[PDB]
Design an enzyme around this catalytic site. Structure first.
Site, short mmCIF file in Angstrom:
data_model
loop_
_atom_site.label_atom_id
_atom_site.label_comp_id
_atom_site.label_asym_id
_atom_site.label_seq_id
_atom_site.Cartn_x
_atom_site.Cartn_y
_atom_site.Cartn_z
CD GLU A 1 -3.93 9.69 2.35
OE1 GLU A 1 -3.60 9.70 3.57
OE2 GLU A 1 -4.46 8.70 1.81
CG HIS B 1 -0.65 8.61 1.46
ND1 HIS B 1 -1.41 7.50 1.50
CD2 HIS B 1 -0.31 8.89 2.76
CE1 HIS B 1 -1.55 7.13 2.80
NE2 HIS B 1 -0.88 7.94 3.56
CB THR C 1 -5.78 8.24 5.35
OG1 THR C 1 -4.46 7.75 5.09
CG2 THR C 1 -5.81 9.56 6.05
CG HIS D 1 -1.75 -1.17 1.24
ND1 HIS D 1 -1.74 -2.10 2.23
CD2 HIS D 1 -2.70 -1.54 0.37
CE1 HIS D 1 -2.68 -3.03 1.96
NE2 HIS D 1 -3.30 -2.65 0.85
CG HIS E 1 2.94 5.95 5.60
ND1 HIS E 1 2.66 5.88 6.92
CD2 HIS E 1 1.91 6.56 5.03
CE1 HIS E 1 1.46 6.42 7.12
NE2 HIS E 1 0.97 6.86 5.97
CG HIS F 1 0.56 10.63 6.52
ND1 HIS F 1 -0.46 9.88 5.92
CD2 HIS F 1 0.32 11.91 6.28
CE1 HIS F 1 -1.29 10.74 5.37
NE2 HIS F 1 -0.85 11.98 5.58
ZN LIG Z 1 -0.68 7.91 5.58
#
Ligand SMILES: [Zn+2]
Length: 257
Positions: A103, A93, A195, A61, A91, A116
């Site tokens: 996000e 996104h 999230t 992910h 991590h 994050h």
């Molecule tokens: Zn995250």
């Protein structure tokens, strides 16, 4: 299982995780004109000098950079927080193109990526207990824009070849997360959620106003990662972001004027 395709993406998650339609879901759009300055908010205290990175993992992910959280070595305090929150992992996104990937959004602007840094409240003893509490986690969110390279990111970029597919890990010691922070620690804060599934409503979000700059080349390397496992059909790890969710009965507070 859940992911970021057409058939398994954010718009489907509610079937397995009904809290997806809850009252305190993340991310959200930050409307800068309606976020009120709260003079009662403190400066954030980010104390990362003793941080101990251990490993980097492709979990299918994203990739997580994991820290030793067995003592108070990298902690977040102050700001909106009561008590002490220990860094467990960070991590990102990111998008398929530079025009999306974050996000959170700011006045509906999407950044190329979002970092994050995840921390858990030491009063609950371990991560798994913390995520069951409304004040269990504190997540520091940092936007990434494409421009100049971030020197402190390059160590992460250059190990990504070794963790291309789901389930691969690599040793990742001596990485200093201070090199991922912008100059200013001015922030917005609100109560929200993870999230990704299980979408638990346990997070105090702290979203920095100032983005960091990364180069096109850096982000390009993120987009060479795979969602799939080794020797499976290749599906590039891109667009691993959840869109903005309804703000509902929340207020976003600003630490700055
Ligand atoms: Zn995250």
């Amino acid at each position: 299982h859940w992911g970021y395709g057409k058939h398994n993406g954010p718009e489907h998650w509610h079937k397995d995780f009904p809290i997806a339609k809850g009252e305190r879901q993340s991310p959200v759009d930050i409307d800068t004109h309606t976020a009120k300055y709260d003079p009662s908010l403190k400066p954030l205290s980010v104390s990362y000098d003793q941080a101990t990175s251990l490993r980097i993992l492709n979990n299918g992910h994203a990739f997580n950079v994991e820290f030793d959280d067995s003592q108070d070595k990298a902690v977040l305090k102050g700001g909106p927080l009561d008590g002490t929150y220990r860094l467990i992992q960070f991590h990102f996104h990111w998008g398929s193109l530079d025009g999306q990937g974050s996000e959170h959004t700011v006045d509906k602007k999407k950044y190329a990526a979002e970092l994050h840094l995840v921390h858990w409240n030491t009063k609950y003893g371990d991560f798994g207990k913390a995520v069951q509490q409304p004040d269990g986690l504190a997540v520091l969110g940092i936007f990434l824009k494409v421009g100049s390279a971030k020197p402190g990111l390059q160590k992460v970029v250059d190990v990504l070849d070794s963790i291309k597919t789901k389930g691969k890990s690599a040793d990742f010691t001596n990485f200093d997360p201070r090199g991922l922070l912008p100059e200013s620690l001015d922030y917005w804060t609100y109560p929200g959620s993870l999230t990704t599934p299980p979408l638990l409503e346990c997070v105090t979000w702290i979203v920095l106003k100032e983005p960091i700059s990364v180069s096109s080349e850096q982000v390009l390397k993120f987009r060479k990662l795979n969602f799939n496992g080794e020797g499976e059909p290749e599906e590039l790890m891109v667009d691993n972001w959840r869109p903005a969710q309804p703000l509902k009965n929340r207020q976003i507070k600003a630490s700055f004027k």
